Design a protein around this nucleic acid. Sequence first.
DNA 1: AAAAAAAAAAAACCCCCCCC
DNA 2: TTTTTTTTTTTT
DNA 3: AAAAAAAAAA
RNA 4: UUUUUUUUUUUU
Length: 1270
Amino acid sequence: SHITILTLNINGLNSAIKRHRLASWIKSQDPSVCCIQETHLTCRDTHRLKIKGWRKIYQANGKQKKAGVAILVSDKTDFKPTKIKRDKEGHYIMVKGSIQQEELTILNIYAPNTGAPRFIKQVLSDLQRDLDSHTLIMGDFNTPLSTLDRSTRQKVNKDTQELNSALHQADLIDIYRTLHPKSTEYTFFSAPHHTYSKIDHIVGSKALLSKCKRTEIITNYLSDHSAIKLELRIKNLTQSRSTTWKLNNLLLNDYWVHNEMKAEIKMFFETNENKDTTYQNLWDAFKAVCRGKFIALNAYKRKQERSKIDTLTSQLKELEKQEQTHSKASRRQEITKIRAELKEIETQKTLQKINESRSWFFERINKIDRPLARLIKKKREKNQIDTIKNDKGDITTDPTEIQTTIREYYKHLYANKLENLEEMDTFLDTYTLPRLNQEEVESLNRPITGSEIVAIINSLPTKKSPGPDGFTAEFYQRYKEELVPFLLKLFQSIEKEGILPNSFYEASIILIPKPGRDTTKKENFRPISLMNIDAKILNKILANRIQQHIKKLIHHDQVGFIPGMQGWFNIRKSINVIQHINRAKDKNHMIISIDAEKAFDKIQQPFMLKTLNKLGIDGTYFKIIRAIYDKPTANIILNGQKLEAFPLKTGTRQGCPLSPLLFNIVLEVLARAIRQEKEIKGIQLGKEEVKLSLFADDMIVYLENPIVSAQNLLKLISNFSKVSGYKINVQKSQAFLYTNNRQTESQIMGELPFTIASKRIKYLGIQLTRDVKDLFKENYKPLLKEIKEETNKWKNIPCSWVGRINIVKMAILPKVIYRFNAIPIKLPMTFFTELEKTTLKFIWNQKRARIAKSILSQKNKAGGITLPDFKLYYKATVTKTAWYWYQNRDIDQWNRTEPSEIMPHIYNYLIFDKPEKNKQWGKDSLFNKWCWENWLAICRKLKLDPFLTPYTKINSRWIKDLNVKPKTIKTLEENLGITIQDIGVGKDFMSKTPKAMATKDKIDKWDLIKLKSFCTAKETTIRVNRQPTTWEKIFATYSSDKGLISRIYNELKQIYKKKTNNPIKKWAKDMNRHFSKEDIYAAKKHMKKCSSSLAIREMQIKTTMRYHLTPVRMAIIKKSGNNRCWRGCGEIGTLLHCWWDCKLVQPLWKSVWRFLRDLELEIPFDPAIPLLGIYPNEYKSCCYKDTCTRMFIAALFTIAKTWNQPKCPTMIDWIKKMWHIYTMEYYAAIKNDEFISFVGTWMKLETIILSKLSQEQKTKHRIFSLIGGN
DNA sequence: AAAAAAAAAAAACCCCCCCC
DNA sequence: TTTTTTTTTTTT
DNA sequence: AAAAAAAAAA
RNA sequence: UUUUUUUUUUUU
Ligand SMILES: [Zn+2]
């Protein structure tokens, strides 16, 4: 074990290019401690010095840029700071701490150019209290210490003699001189004297000499100073930071890497396959060899990308050593030239990397993506853990104790395994469970095919962290066309044998701190399990196979992880139950929210296997399931260190795509046990018996007569947990009590161990209320409070208005949509007006709405930027229930639990059905009546007939009013169809197919007469045989509810097209011109299509929508006569003047038009073309639209930069904007494989720009040729 | 009689880009 | 000049 | 019928 | 810093 400390004078850290030079340089050496002198920074600039992998940065700076120091500690160093102090002027900084339980003090000092020895002596005198045997004083001393430190072999002056005497007094010696008495290496070059001297020194107490190993001076190209590396021996307390290898996506994207990697895979699979080894061990060897080859390719890539750098570095070292031996001017000139060339090439490399990053950020500058989501989101808490309460009860910091305690805790969590199989079988036998038939069990046991593997791999989410092997989903996706055969062979092997590779058993658990909880307690840490991609592929194949039948295996009461089943089914059902209990004249009911204590990790694997056997699952599928849970294990990745693996004897392996389905199956045994237990009394809502409802492990149990029912439920829960491990926290589980006598409530409190909430309980993020009359108060008022709180949090968020529009869509809209879905009750207009005011105040940053919310409320015709309409989303959510009304699915028990004292089955007969017979129904209804009222509202708004439609069901009242026998109506439904159009009307009555007369043959004559009398009537014929609009198709055609809210919202937006002013027509009025509909369509399309990135579209939206503010507008606002044009003209300051007719902006437009003339484009000098994108009918050619679009948008950016600045906007700024967009779009295109289009649209523009730019401006603005004729 | 659409009146805050 | 809010009228 | 992103619940 | 389900938005 050794510690490396590096010193370096750098002479400024202000250039954004220069700081990245530090990041690459420091990471290249990878030292334990790196210190920086002469940062040329102030106090307020400390926030800018951030380096990846070095989180411990201590910066001391003054009020002016004359000095500055910093001490940095790498993340791989076990450093515990103890004392930190900073000099006022930033000339020096010292940090004292313990590395591997050994004291070490670092004093980084940047001496002044004049009087350095006196300053160093004063610093030593001031720091005498901190000096010790483990204290190092080092940095730029600006003076040699010995004769051998000068190339001229000259003695030191009197000041340096005083400094040496002070060092001797302070018991300090030169470590570098002691280790290398005859060394002549130098770090500084004095230009006026043409001499070399060593002015950077490291000194310390002689006690450290017992640990000193070696030291050297490594010359640097960063500045004129040379770095010094000191290596010291330390006690062997090294942390085993063997970071798990991971396959980054950048390495995969390289074509040469792709070719060599596929060649290596092919060669391995052609040589290392045989009859003597199984496919599992061969697959493990394949993974190991792939990891080795990937490491080798990454290493050679790192070597080749640094080939020229390394060559110039070697030449620099040779010339520097020769100069140190004897100084010559020619060698100095050669060193200067080669250093300049190397600096230029490395600066180009840094520009390439930073431009890649900036283009990635710019393509998603304001879109719905990571840069915005992480912008609004709070800074993610570090996963490193430094303090955990141990088993004894003491607060400890020792990393080995923390690791041992956390590993023992997570091992004991998964080690409680039960072996009582007899009790398991008895419990499974006691209560009936569904069984799959032969067809479904053969569907499960069907062989795996290559197409299934391709579909599974193509569905794998990307950008997800890999498992222990470090192989990501992109590895399988890119190499799929070679990986399907051998993955298929492996899967056939595991089907035949039932043995999985050892990689399928290992998982990586990462600990995440729970927000709002104590991070010093081990029990407030969320365990997240990561799996290898192949294991996830197999598990997801099995999950899909069992998901094809999970509808039969799982009752509809459980909605978690069930496809086509939505969470709010339980919320609405629970609210309806609460309403019924409230309406009951005598209250003897209980509603429990069972809080399971880590149910996912407490389900016994043997119980899972026994349950799967009892459900009729056998063959290859059950064998594979057993093989998965044969020897599972996981290891905790704590502080980046892989801990010892511990077995998963019990619990279901999280992070597995198949795990939720297995947990649902296991919990369904308990669910059916509760439902089939007659001693547990549910709540009877007419013909619907409601006992319990499930969402994953979250369970709600409704009971009647709780005194006996709750005890029976607890007894059955204990019996279930004795065989499955499903432990519940009964003392924490919240519940309601509804009792008509307080003594009974007290007795129930005494007997039961549940805790009863007086007002609300949380359930699926929804605050269920004891009295449903307070649903709005307990669910929507806090919603507005939270929305206002987040708005205030993002009051000064650094984004434009489109960024905040997308923020509203991305963070506020989903929560509001979910709350609407859960509780779509009649909401007063006050709530919506407050929500709209809060959102709008957020959007415009407390300013007035520059662009009317009515314009942005429109579709993409407003510019592809939509402001969310919360009223329309509310209406869509309310009307969504009508779809479930029409479908009348048997699994929708939530819709049949609405209280009603009349018309028990009505909700299936409103959609496309005769109106109620003047019956006042749903008086106490909470969700259905409002949905019906809204449905009628939109139906009347459409001038539509909502009572008879081509989609009217056969089961509808339109045929049941004719006293038709049931058997006839079932026959019609089964043989013909669902809608009346299938039967036929008028001349088409039962005549659209020979099957029509066939079914007529087995129809009762009276019912057939009634059907003929009804269908052939003229009114029915016209009302049926008409083309249905989109609104009818939304609720009748699709049998799937996926994307229902989107379609209803789009249709409602089309319906509620409020009249809006068209500001493009206002623009036309400004320039005394009239635009046709073609011109407006072209302007809108240009606004939507201006550029792929959102900033350019935002600029075009701002200029076309008259977002920018005009001087006459201000004169009117202030009610004053100061309507004169800004920047000084003497003319009126209208918007068209500010954009086009301004005398101070005309030269820029003349330069632009000269550029178009150089493009051989005779575009007329008409402001519509650049300001709005409207082209004359004579210039419909699209071979140049993109180029001129980019030039005009850059001109608009430049003009907007100088909106009121009296200076004329300059052509060089316009070219600078061109090159900013050039870099952004080029790197976006090279990332998106759009090279050909990018060249085709900017090649001539780049040529013209380079021809019109002088060499000095090109060099100073980093403008140069970047693409070729490729 | 209640809900939805339209018209009239009033009040706003002299830039605009930039900013991960 | 443009936007939002309130008020008045009309229709279901 | 694909890709990407977010959010909600567990 | 996973897994599943559901929901929305944008780009064809
Ligand atoms: Zn002007």
